Design a binder for this molecule. Structure first.
Ligand SMILES: Nc1ncnc2c1ncn2[C@@H]1O[C@H](COP(=O)(O)OP(=O)(O)OP(=O)(O)O)C[C@H]1O
Ligand SMILES: Nc1ncnc2c1ncn2[C@@H]1O[C@H](COP(=O)(O)OP(=O)(O)O)[C@@H](O)[C@H]1O
Ligand SMILES: Nc1ncnc2c1ncn2[C@@H]1O[C@H](COP(=O)(O)OP(=O)(O)O)C[C@H]1O
Ligand SMILES: Nc1ncnc2c1ncn2[C@@H]1O[C@H](COP(=O)(O)OP(=O)(O)O)C[C@H]1O
Ligand SMILES: Nc1ncnc2c1ncn2[C@@H]1O[C@H](COP(=O)(O)OP(=O)(O)O)C[C@H]1O
Ligand SMILES: Nc1ncnc2c1ncn2[C@@H]1O[C@H](COP(=O)(O)OP(=O)(O)O)C[C@H]1O
Ligand SMILES: [Mg+2]
Lengths: 313, 304, 316, 307, 303, 318
């Protein structure tokens, strides 16, 4: 049973890889990716590095503005790494739970990022749950590991450590960075952090870049992501619409692309489904400039919606 | 009921607002709510969420009520404030658990998942484990059907990160209610965090929200809302007083103008009067205070 | 035939309060039922007693907002006296919930039980029975009384919800307010009046978040606010005179006028509190009533909080 | 001892302070304390409490010691400090419970509630023992075997106490067996410990409105001279008449507490070679600092540290 | 590292600028040498070491050399101050484990921590091994050699953490303590009080402080050369100058990161040595922390 | 039959401190009994040592207020020496009570036990008898047996209980709870003398967070405290201390190097200067010198640093 959180990887369905040529240069539009060339090219170097077994102790940081494909690149890194590599996208804040401890939240996402080839492509977690289903314990983990280990020593199975993507890294506390430090220091996956912030106070007065302490940042490589051109904005929206199965006019694409540059690429893409449903109620096939203009007026981006309340106070 | 007058959003199949079903004005938010309703009915609402950003008493609670009501009958509902989850009897997660289990219903009448938990409680974790596996057991036979509704969390700015992380986890379920949130605050710090964010909600969650905005009501829009509540309270009032009360609603608060209706009928009644008059209003306004006048009087004392 | 747990001390200074003192039209007379002046607050308290009776106080609460000593505690006791005699009244202060010995849930629950009673006529409350059937009040000890009470009700051998006065409302944490809100929602529950002397205040249990009187806006929305005002030396003199009558203390108009003008510079509570030591100093001085010089002596011998705080600060 | 000379307040029949009973000056505070004693005797003290506001060394501890002495010669007195409730070996309320129980006496010959509890505990203190003695003493009081004598609980530095501790005081004073609570402080408007709210004496308003506040002003040159002469007698130290003049001026300059600290030390300087002189007072002044000099030199060193 | 085999000092205690791997940092190496003799002659009792300087001034490198100049069997443990704050480990347990890791026993050399691993670790196991180690030391079967304990980012360490180090150095079997920080006057963690290097004043009074000067062009060049001569990556002289220029505008640590990346671009371009082309392209591809924060400040300030 | 568990690495730099250096009349000599200068503090310490003997120190403690390297712990050791030979002296720091493993109540008790002893003839402290029975740990029940044995010897008339000195440094680091424990145990008849030290003025009491008091001591305890002042030494007094410090260490040095090491102390602290005598001696042993010349002294001052200077160096860079 595949316990992959389907929803978390729903905005990146079109991403098939980095789309770089035999040497290592990015094409305008390849493997579902558009623009963001320098970042895509730098990702390929890390793809060759893991395959060269030279990422030992080394981690990755994809830092830039939100909606500049930081999650998309991290997914493509797993895609390029091998055939169906275990990609787990977590958020720094996910460890803060009243119900379960940080340790078990981190372990769960780590097991979700280490796979197994038996051709049966199943992760360590997709087997952890198979054993319990009342709750995943540490003795229960030893039971799966005893099974997992013999498979290699019998030659039946080969282990595949993947990609653990972490957005909002500055949110993790001092204890959480120490946990990751041991994890990275091992058949462990690749920790890829993503930050939209600069100098930040480490959670738990000690300020440092991206909220990551200097002890971990010494072993961290940074790959910058950049804002998109209005031509790239039109492309990414068109891909998402082609992946979603929604018809849209180029007259509306200019507007929806302009909306994106003004707000964010994530919000403009998320406007496709409501714009589609507005049109279905009118009995149309495609989305026109007026359909976008209406939805963009009906709905607001969190940035301009909190601006109205401040304007009113 | 404070929203007893609401039966729906008052929209036609062309999704244009009538300006109907208990709704008056707030044309912008009423239309956007119908679009949101279409996404739920089309099953294109997973991963996503709703956020009604507006000044207190501008429709937000009623728009979410009208949304649950227009989605058909027997649809479960739960209206909890952000501060309600912080209890001496409960736990932050357990309080939200019960709010999620209240907005998820089971049809043979429609019995909510929390109601089932009430039968086996003085709710213990062992109790929920047995019920959850028994509902999927009733799903195999097809005897029972899971019909989740709306969970309206007003004062969302009160929620901390431990609770926002819980929301993410709770919304990940195949059977999940549509989360409707409301706030009056703009850029606020997330409770439990040092960082600032629009509406006091984390950056990750705002990238899933269908943000809708409620604007203030004009004199004509307030007069109809006050007329509806007067008729709802069985309080016949003079048209001269409907003017004065709506002026108080604009200058002070709608929540306060409605608060004065109940007490104005009694002032009128005690003086053996027919319908509520301006002098019953002028008096009830001088008797009961509004937070603005209430605080300024305290500010005027401390300075002396 | 049982006992009474009623906190005698807390309501000793309010013994003269016999009700609200409002005429048939609903309007307040200057001095009636033990209350002096405070017309608009007494009139606003009338509508509350009407609202309780007409069954229109669902999910609603009250707030008495004014300077300290302006009859906030007196009016909440007057509402209890207006609904009927022996109708339970519970005067608590926000800081009372913060005890190392007893849990925050246990302090509040006791007060609610002290604020709800029954007429069996046996004029008794829910907490009175609790101590009687423990002569430790636990979850099990309480429930045993609830079933016993229910048995008397079903047949016909009468539940009377009273008034729960919560002074220093800003002292309560956000978790304490939720406990109140859920409890106020019930039908057999008593009307909760809050009292403040502050404006926009930071809600305890939080940080940064400021709200009118330190009350969450979730609760504050279902709250009817009544303003109480500072008394003139003339209004005060009428209160100091009534209290002297209630305590059987003889006093001259000259001393009373000086005692009333002290009330202006201090509080109504401070002046009335001097009525007893001055009466005792007159006893020593072999005099019948309190002379103008006895009040002036006890004013020199004893100080108010603000005056003694100023002395210490000015000396340093 | 330090309050060994105190034998009462030294007031006459009209509660007028007559130098008497080991007391010197502080007339306004003595007659005020005398009024409290009459308010206790009648039975109007219930609901109320006492507070001695004043600077350190102004006679606050002495007046309450006099108040307990004047009440009865066989009455309990419990002097505690605000900080004493913050202990490693105890709780805030456990120290306060012991402080209240030490002040309530039992007649049968007299014995405090704490001695009765400490004896049965040793046969910290199991709560079950306390609930038993309470019911036991109640029967003894009912029958007429034992008589309860509520003593005096003096709590100095009352600004150290928290909302949780003031809550305990409100609950303990609610008892009929409750003693007379005489608090004392050197602080004006400060924040109430455990809260973000500022209040006179650091005491909550709900307790201030039940307080009988008394003020103690510093002593004159004549008052300071007699206190030091009464201390010299209690410490059997012989001093020259112009040494008193120099010691008192130092006692006015700095503090009376410090002037008394100098008495003991200055006599052993005289014992190094009959009667303590001005130079023994002057020598010991350079030998031992007063807190105001100790902090001044440290400020002077920390000021030059920036240069 | 993998190049630091010792301090590189003569009989009169004087560095050679290029000996035992060590390059430049003469005054600090000579200062470090004086400590070696104080450990040797047995006059390091009730005293500890601190190395202060900017990040990448060879603080960790000099600590590595000290143990190597003490013997090839002497234990060495280099923990960071941010590593004692663990989920699965107490702040004092991570320090006990780092202390025992620094104390080796002879047979072959095995740390007191490695003996715990074979048998967090329980306080019951601790009394057992210590009682057995007390027997072997008296008999003569085993030789307990106290090693070197290096603690980088020591400004992270709290009041209790520093109070632990005091009780741990009160031991006769205790290893040497060498600390590191780039911060000047900082507050003592767990208190409102400020102090030099975030260390309590009573411990500072015991420290033998050593200052490290930042490397010049020629000083930085050999450090990069040695690491390239270590990483099996050959590069042009024209690329070595470019890499030092970058490593002085950014940091030495970032320059070392570009070696592994430039060597990859080189092989993928079918080249012999790593040219300037492979360095400048790899400079734009991966950024340094100083450049990373600059763009985020530009974006977040306007957003 | 006896074994002492004294921490000598704490009293290491005070090997020369024989006593206070006072005469019959109670005046300090310029240089005597291992101490130089600090005459007014030394004359005051004598008045305290004389008061402990007369038994007029009931409920009283001592506080030494002065900058670092002014002889605060030196004068406290001299107080114990001037009390008598083999009188127990226990130096500690306010930080020591803080540990996640050992409870603060036990830390304070350990140091309290080291500050009280017995005189039979073999002088030993009560903590030495606590560890001797533990061939493991020290519990309250373990202390209960040891105390009953210790009192039986006095009840029979064998060994006199000789309490001494408990020296507590960085007193601002102690919390409100620690202060109550000290004050309650200060009242005891068989208790030692508590000597405090401060290089701070008005400080926030630890645990109060808001409340400020002199030297971080809650005023209930400061009322019972005797204050003595320690002052910075004249460069003449500086050379004098370093001279005896080299002699007791057995290190030979020129009077010219003593002049340079003396002037460094005035610039920094006296503690830093005496801590340069060991690296300079070992440096001269490498060059081939049986004495320390200005050369070695200048070099060690340029190679090794003091807290103040090194922190300022990093501040320039950052
Ligand atoms: N468009 C409307 N049509 C009918 N009734 C309305 C409309 N807008 C508000 N009301 C009524 O006026 C009342 C004010 O409450 P409401 O607007 O829902 O609060 P809110 O805006 O969501 O914020 P708060 O709950 O007060 O904090 C209750 C509601 O039924
Ligand atoms: N309007 C009034 N009429 C009669 N007595 C009054 C009036 N206002 C206050 N008092 C009395 O004055 C005293 C202090 O008033 P209180 O009600 O406690 O004020 P608050 O609650 O505002 O602090 C009490 O004894 C109270 O009964
Ligand atoms: N270069 C590209 N080419 C094609 N699609 C792209 C794309 N960059 C982004 N996308 C798509 O736009 C969406 C939002 O980008 P997101 O991954 O969430 O960025 P961030 O982590 O900062 O939040 C999802 C992603 O698949
Ligand atoms: N008016 C007086 N009459 C007689 N003796 C007096 C005296 N004032 C002081 N003294 C004596 O000096 C001592 C000074 O300490 P204390 O009075 O307790 O200071 P505090 O304000 O903190 O309570 C106590 C008392 O015995
Ligand atoms: N003197 C030298 N000789 C040879 N290589 C040297 C060197 N000083 C540095 N290095 C190398 O550059 C890196 C610098 O970091 P590091 O040594 O770990 O200390 P710090 O804490 O200050 O950052 C690592 C080391 O291999
Ligand atoms: N008057 C004197 N005569 C001889 N030696 C003296 C001396 N004063 C000090 N010393 C010596 O300097 C050394 C450091 O002084 P230290 O006592 O530890 O500093 P602090 O004031 O903070 O307590 C050790 C001490 O014995
Ligand atoms: Mg470094």
């Amino acid at each position: 049973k595949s316990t992959t959180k389907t929803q978390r990887i729903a905005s990146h369905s079109h991403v098939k890889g980095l789309g770089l040529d035999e040497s290592g240069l990015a094409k305008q539009a390849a493997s579902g990716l558009v623009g963001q060339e320098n970042a895509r090219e730098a990702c390929g170097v890390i793809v060759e590095l893991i395959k060269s077994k030279k990422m030992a102790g080394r981690a990755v940081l994809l830092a830039g503005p939100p909606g500049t494909g930081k999650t998309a690149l991290a997914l493509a890194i797993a895609q390029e790494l091998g055939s169906k590599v275990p990609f787990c996208p977590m958020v720094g804040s996910e460890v803060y739970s009243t119900e379960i401890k940080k340790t078990e939240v981190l372990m769960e996402n780590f097991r979700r990022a280490i796979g197994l080839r038996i051709i049966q492509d199943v992760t360590l977690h997709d087997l952890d749950v198979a054993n319990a289903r009342t709750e995943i314990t540490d003795k229960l983990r030893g039971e799966i590991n005893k099974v997992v280990n013999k498979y290699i020593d019998q030659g039946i199975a080969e282990l595949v450590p993947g990609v653990l993507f972490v957005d909002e890294v500055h949110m993790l506390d001092i204890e959480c960075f120490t946990y990751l430090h041991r994890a990275l220091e091992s058949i462990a996956p690749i920790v890829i952090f993503a930050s939209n912030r600069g100098n930040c106070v480490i959670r738990g007065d000690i300020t440092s870049p991206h909220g990551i302490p200097l002890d971990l940042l010494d072993r961290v490589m940074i790959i910058r992501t950049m804002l998109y051109t209005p031509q790239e904005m039109k492309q990414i929206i068109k891909i998402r619409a082609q992946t979603e199965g929604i018809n849209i006019s180029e007259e509306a694409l200019n507007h929806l692309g302009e909306i994106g540059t003004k707000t964010t690429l994530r919000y403009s893409v998320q406007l496709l489904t409501p714009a589609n449903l507005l049109a279905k109620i009118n009995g149309k096939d495609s989305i026109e400039k007026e359909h976008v203009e209406e939805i963009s007026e009906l709905f607001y981006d969190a940035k301009s919606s909190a601006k109205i309340l401040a304007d009113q106070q | 009921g404070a929203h007893s007058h609401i039966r729906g959003l008052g929209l036609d199949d062309a999704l244009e607002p009538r300006q109907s079903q208990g709704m008056v004005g707030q044309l912008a938010a009423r239309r956007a709510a119908g679009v949101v309703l279409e996404m739920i009915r089309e099953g294109k609402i997973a991963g996503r969420a709703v956020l009604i950003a507006g000044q207190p008493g501008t429709g937000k609670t009623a728009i979410a009520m009208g949304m649950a009501q227009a989605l058909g009958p027997d649809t479960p509902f739960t209206a909890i404030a952000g501060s309600e989850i912080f209890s001496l009897e409960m736990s932050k997660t357990e309080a939200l658990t019960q709010a999620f289990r209240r907005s998820i219903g089971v049809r043979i009448h429609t019995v909510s998942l929390h109601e089932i938990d009430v039968i086996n409680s003085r709710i213990k974790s062992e109790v929920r484990e047995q019920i959850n596996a028994k509902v999927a057991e009733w799903r195999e036979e097809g005897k029972a059907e899971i019909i989740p509704g709306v969970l309206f969390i007003d004062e969302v700015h009160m929620l901390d990160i431990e609770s926002f992380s819980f929301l993410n986890r709770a919304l990940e379920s195949d059977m999940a209610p549509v989360l409707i949130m409301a706030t009056n605050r703009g850029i606020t710090r997330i409770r439990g965090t040092s960082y600032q964010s629009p509406h006091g909600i984390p950056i990750d969650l705002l990238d899933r929200l269908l943000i809708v905005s409620t604007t203030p009501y004009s004199e004509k829009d307030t007069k109809q809302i006050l007329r509806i509540r007067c008729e709802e309270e069985d309080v016949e009032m003079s048209e001269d007083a409907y003017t004065v009360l709506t002026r108080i609603g604009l200058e002070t608060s709608l929540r306060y103008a409605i608060q004065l209706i109940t007490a104005a009928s009694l002032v009128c009644r005690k003086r053996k009067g027919t319908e509520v008059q301006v002098d019953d209003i002028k008096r009830v306004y001088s008797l009961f205070l509004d937070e603005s006048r209430s605080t300024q009087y305290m500010k005027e004392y401390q300075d002396a």
